[PDB]
Amino acid sequence: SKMQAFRIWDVNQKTFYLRNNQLVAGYLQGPNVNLEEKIDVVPIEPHALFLGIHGGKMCLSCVKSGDETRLQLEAVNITDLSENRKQDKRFAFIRSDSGPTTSFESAACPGWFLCTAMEADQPVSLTNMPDEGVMVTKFYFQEDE
Amino acid sequence: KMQAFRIWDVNQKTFYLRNNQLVAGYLQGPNVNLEEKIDVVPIEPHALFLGIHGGKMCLSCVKSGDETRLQLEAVNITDLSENRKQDKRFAFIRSDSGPTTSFESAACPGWFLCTAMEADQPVSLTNMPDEGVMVTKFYFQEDE
Numbered sequence: 001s002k003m004q005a006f007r008i009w010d011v012n013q014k015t016f017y018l019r020n021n022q023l024v025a026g027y028l029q030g031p032n033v034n035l036e037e038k039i040d041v042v043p044i045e046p047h048a049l050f051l052g053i054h055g056g057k058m059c060l061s062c063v064k065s066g067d068e069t070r071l072q073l074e075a076v077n078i079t080d081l082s083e084n085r086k087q088d089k090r091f092a093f094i095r096s097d098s099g100p101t102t103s104f105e106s107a108a109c110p111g112w113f114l115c116t117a118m119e120a121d122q123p124v125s126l127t128n129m130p131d132e133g134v135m136v137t138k139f140y141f142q143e144d145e
Numbered sequence: 146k147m148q149a150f151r152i153w154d155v156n157q158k159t160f161y162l163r164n165n166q167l168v169a170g171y172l173q174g175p176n177v178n179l180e181e182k183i184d185v186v187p188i189e190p191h192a193l194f195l196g197i198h199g200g201k202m203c204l205s206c207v208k209s210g211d212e213t214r215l216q217l218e219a220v221n222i223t224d225l226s227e228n229r230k231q232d233k234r235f236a237f238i239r240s241d242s243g244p245t246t247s248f249e250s251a252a253c254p255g256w257f258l259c260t261a262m263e264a265d266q267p268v269s270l271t272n273m274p275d276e277g278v279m280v281t282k283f284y285f286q287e288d289e
Contacts, residue, residue, distance in 0.1 A: 118207040118216075120218075130210075136208075
């Protein structure tokens, strides 16, 4: 259970980058390629994990705002989280591989998978309609190391 | 470099923009001026980039599982690169059959550029070009 660095891009080749402290998927080229966000990962045996950016300084979570289930980026240290604390569960994600791609399902909001839009520069989100082909839910997740 | 062509399908439909969505229909009267010529930057062997407006807008295929989508992105066709991972979505493979031509998505293999049998529908992509529902055969005339 320690911090690993991963590079991620969806099946349409979009990368993650921040815009107004929001995570968005898009195509970075040239000087802007330096905006690419690597994903910091702390494994939770056997198939879950905590996901973050900026050296695990900000972590991804699933939050329910009234009637909405939205992805959120919180200012918490990936290292303070615990697979055994009820409150940190909103940060857990289940990793599932199939072929050369990877999917991430929310542990606190099951049935919700991390996703990106087909159009560029849209924020990264969570959809509960994976196979219904509107949002992308498959990613190439590789250990940047 | 950029080569220009005129395109029209086997049913005589031409491409034109409608609410900035590439649609295919029959232009009449002063509307014939709405025809969109296709700009091409070939990629040896038989691959190529396709655009309109002097290469200022290029078509691409983006997928989501078992479904694909045809998009017109505001990118310069000259900035696209064949040795660039992300630009593959703009690549198309050309094939000719007799006097006709077909275009297959490199990013979404098995999906061909196609038109609806009826007029004024958006140009799209189809995974089944054989079972004739959508039209996938085109006349592609090099504007020389």
